[PDB]
Structure formats: C-alpha cells, structure tokens
Design a protein around this ligand. Structure first.
Ligand SMILES: O=C(O)c1ccccc1/N=N/c1ccc(O)cc1
Ligand SMILES: O=C(O)c1ccccc1/N=N/c1ccc(O)cc1
Ligand SMILES: O=C(O)c1ccccc1/N=N/c1ccc(O)cc1
Ligand SMILES: O=C(O)c1ccccc1/N=N/c1ccc(O)cc1
Lengths: 116, 119, 116, 119
C-alpha cells in the first residue's frame, strides 16, 4: 500500500518492494557498498493491521548469480507515512566466519529510506 | 538439510524452518515470552553456497508479531550463522522494533542474542 | 583538544566534556528524554594518538542526588574534526531487571552530536 | 564489594575492577583476541543504589585500545547488569567502533555479547 514502491537510502542503494495483503514483503535490493553486484532477492514481513508507525523487517543474503559475499543483512524498523514516506531502520550484517573469528562476525548500523 | 528442522532457543521458543535449495527460509515461530500466543509466520534468506574453509553459513529471518489471535504491532529480525556438526547450532543477534509515535521513536528498538539448538 | 567542549544531540541533550592528555574523558550529561533530571556524571576514554576519525566511548549511570532510573547508557563512536566537528555514535541503554525480563533489558539507538 | 574483583569472559579476557561507593568503575582489561597486547585502562559507571525487587544492577564501561605497546585506533563499550548470588555474573552487550575515513564509516561498528564470571 504505502509500503509498496521504490526507495533509496543515504548510501545510494535501491530497495524495490511489494507488500502483500497477508503481511509478506517481496522484492529486490541493489547495493552501493561492499562486495556486491546486480540485484539480490529480499523477503520480509510487516504489520498488516497497524494502529504510530508500522513495524517491519526484511533480510538479504548477499548471493546472486554473479557474486557471493558469504554474508547476510537484516533490517528492522518502522514505516512512517505522510507527504514524505520514510522507513527508519537499524541493521545487522553477519559474515560467515571460522569459530576463532566469530566475535567479529557482526556489524551494526542504521539506514533511512526515502520513497520515490 | 542441515538448517531444515525444528530448533529451540534459551527461552524455550520454537523455530520450525525449511531451507530451499535456492536460498529461501520459510516456516513458523512460537514464542515463550512477550505479548504472543500461538504460531507466527517467518521468512528469511541464507547463503546456499557457503565457503569451504570451515566457516559458518550466514542467514537471517523476520517475524511480524501478528496472527489470528493477537497483534503486538512489532517485528523481530535475527541475523547470524549456522554451524554444523554433531551438535549443530545457530548463533544470532536480534533487533525487535515496535511501531511508536515520534516522541517515543528513540526507544523503539531492543537488541539481544539467541542461541538455537535441536534439543 | 578538539573533543573538549559542549555538544548537543538531536534530542536536545547536552554533553560537557574534557579530554585528558592520558586519554581520559570526564564531564557531565544533561538529558532531554526518559526518567532524568539535572546533571549526571560521565566517564570515558578516547584514542589520544589517532592516525580517519578518533575512536571514543563514554558511560552515564542515570543516578544523581535527585533521581535514580536504575539504568545506564554507553555511547561508542568516533570524533570527526574540521570546520564543524561531530561525534557520530551508537548507544546501548540497559535497565536493571528481574531474570524473567532480562530479554528486554537493552535498547539500541544512534545519536549525532554537534559542537557549540 | 559484589562487583569489585577479577572477572573473565568466554574468550578468556581478564577484567579487574574496583567499584566506588559513589558509582565509579575503574580498573584494567587484558584481551585474549584482537590487535592487543598487555593491559588497558578502563573507566565506567554503575547504579550505586539498585532496586530492592531482585533486579540486576545496571552498569557500563569503556576501553580505548591504546597502551604503551600498541594502538588499534578503536574503543569498545560494554553495557549490561551485574547479578549477585552464589555464582555471580555480569551479562553484557558491547559495541566496538574503529576510527575510519568517511568511505568506511558504514562498517565502523561491530556488535557482540559477553558473559563475565569469577572463574
Ligand atoms: O548496501 C546497503 O544498503 C547496506 C546497508 C546495510 C548493511 C549492508 C549494506 N550492503 N551490504 C553489502 C555487503 C556485502 C555485499 O557484497 C554487498 C552489500
Ligand atoms: O520469543 C523469542 O524467542 C524471542 C527471541 C528474541 C527476541 C524476541 C523474542 N520474542 N519476543 C516477543 C515479542 C512480542 C511477542 O508477542 C512475543 C515474543
Ligand atoms: O538523553 C539522551 O541523550 C539519551 C541518548 C541515548 C540513550 C538514552 C538517553 N537518555 N536516556 C535516559 C534514560 C533514563 C533517564 O532517567 C534519563 C535519560
Ligand atoms: O578482548 C575481549 O574480551 C573483547 C570483548 C568484547 C569485544 C571486544 C573484545 N576485544 N576486542 C579487541 C579489539 C582490539 C584489540 O587490540 C584487542 C581486543
């Protein structure tokens, strides 16, 4: 509804998503940073009967037919409607590692998405 | 195969998942704590072609806390890695965000960690 | 040096700090949000021989002579100098809880500080 | 008294601290992993008058990874709570931020969790 569309973040990445009546999120993600190229599949869920913003989250595993970074990012946040819609999030990016390096496997950040 | 199955965290929550050959995660989650009752749908992704150096397999999934019985107006995302072996595990870090007004946006997200096992 | 001074964040809070030659950080914090009133003591450390931004962190326990919220926040980030100095951070706020509620003890966020 | 002492995390790092009556934490930290060698100074704060309902005691501390021997140009902050008893513990979540250029600021901070015990 308000969620379905094309969005961009401060890094220049692109998120295209469709919100299903059943609370599913499906689309593709195109990243401006890291070891990535071309599009990647995304899947997520959202509150389909919100009351405040609308809670949602989605994941991307950084593997496609061209590259594999052996990592995955999860974005957790809320959708805020109005004139200028926005998705405020915090993310976790975890890399596959050996046991010895597991302590440094996860990065944390925050991204804000603007609807086109 | 490795990931596909029924898992449990430290709180006693149950995670039932199927890992597709293609990278998809699909299943149901039942929580032991919080404003929840019954099963909830989950969706996620994982690295279907991990490295061959003994590294873990990266993955992540989301659950929106709404079902036929209740709605907490929130969602959690888990990000981590699957570590195979005799006693397999999924080590994660999670973020739970609630829908809030602007005045409360500063305290909308909780952070934690969960360890899943087959027992 | 560049760090010593008065700073403000997006919430309207105030951070007054002095950076010691030995890498110590000392000052007071005045919060615009939560269960807080008047000033609170802060203590931290910073890289006294940086190369990029300057790594630093500080803590505040939300107890003073007037109120006690039974909680503490830790800010971890980097100092970026220039015309307009800034401290970019991510924080963790943990509340004292019973065993049963420990899973919901910690909040995570991000704050940007501007130097006055 | 409860907090004051020598503690160890899961990685084998050593945390030696003194808790002042007033809310101060002061001590030294020795890391088992990462770009570190020897002891590092730490500083923090804690709730000197916790609640009487069986709740934990909130606390936090920072370490900047620079000493007489090396400098990693980074700092970690731990935030958590002390839980007294026969087998006392300090449960935490931590953030490690490295000094980076603007181009790398997106990947400057790592997140994790540590459990400290007296053994
Ligand atoms: O692009 C973002 O918006 C983005 C935002 C948050 C976290 C990660 C991100 N991207 N992370 C990668 C990682 C490995 C790659 O191979 C490609 C992208
Ligand atoms: O249940 C876990 O395993 C679980 C694990 C990690 C983070 C959160 C959790 N659960 N958080 C809730 C929130 C709202 C509810 O209505 C039910 C559960
Ligand atoms: O004010 C900030 O900048 C601030 C920024 C991040 C996290 C917490 C903050 N403040 N958190 C409190 C908590 C309890 C209180 O009693 C008073 C303030
Ligand atoms: O040592 C721990 O217990 C530890 C625990 C939690 C997070 C980080 C840790 N250590 N991170 C480093 C980083 C740079 C160094 O030079 C040495 C250690």
């Amino acid at each position: 509804a308000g969620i379905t569309g094309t969005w961009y973040n401060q890094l220049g990445s692109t998120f295209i998503v469709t919100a299903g009546a059943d609370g599913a999120l499906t689309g593709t993600y195109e990243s401006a940073v890291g070891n990535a190229e071309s599009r990647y599949v995304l899947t997520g869920r959202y509150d389909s009967a919100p009351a405040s913003g609308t809670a949602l989250g989605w994941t991307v595993a950084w593997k496609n037919n061209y590259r594999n970074a052996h990592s995955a990012t999860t974005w957790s946040g809320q959708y805020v409607g109005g004139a200028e819609a926005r998705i405020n999030t915090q993310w976790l990016l975890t890399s596959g590692t050996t046991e010895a390096n597991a302590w440094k496997s996860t990065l944390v950040g925050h991204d804000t998405f603007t609807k086109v």
